[PDB]
Symmetry: D2
Subunit: 71 residues, 4 copies
């Protein structure tokens, strides 16, 4: 239990999906964001008409920067 601590993923009542994870390393977090943005970006290229995908990818881009700028 203490080893897992977090890492929760579920369906929200608002109609969204909630994911809450943790990492004892800044590199792991940065790599995690980097991993998802790359896949996300690929989806955007496959679906140029997908605004939500672009905004989502942009959110990851912002998140990656946020984590990078995080102490």
């Amino acid at each position: 239990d203490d080893s897992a601590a977090e890492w929760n993923v579920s369906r929200t009542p608002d109609g969204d999906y909630r994911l809450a994870i943790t990492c004892p390393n800044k590199e792991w977090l940065l790599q995690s964001i980097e991993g998802m943005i790359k896949e996300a970006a690929a989806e955007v290229l496959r679906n140029p008409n997908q605004e939500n995908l672009r905004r989502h990818a942009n959110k990851l881009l912002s998140l990656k920067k946020r984590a990078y700028e995080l102490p």
Copy 2:
């Protein structure tokens, strides 16, 4: 408070770093987890001796499975 709502990342005392994001699609979440697992794996390949890295990657494997089972 109806713009971002989620997508929070900060340093936790017991978890080091806490990331709480959201996605309006299960496919997006699945792709996101896949990205982090990929990077994690690359780290494990470089650090086969890193148990925590394997446990982290394993957590992503579990998370991916969890998201798959999610509605």
Copy 3:
């Protein structure tokens, strides 16, 4: 020389840099192409106005399709 056989990367007069690899698995090749497009996509996201990047990404998309069609 037969030790490596393939897996070569150098400067090509016709393409600047040439990457030549091999894989005895259909999945490995598909995963390889998917890996590069994923990274390439991230570059396109960072440089949306980069036509050559978009074209490059398209080249990967085409390459992936070519590999998909391959027996």
Copy 4:
């Protein structure tokens, strides 16, 4: 007659699958290798007993090193 030039993928009798690509940036090639290594590593984690997978991943690591030194 030769509009493709590069970006070739086919079945080689000497290597099963032959892939030859080009990029005007060394970074792109490095990222390309990184992409395949990431996916490959994930497969290695899924199949730790797969020597060819580990060797393949190592081939990517070696290629990554080669590209890193490549000016």
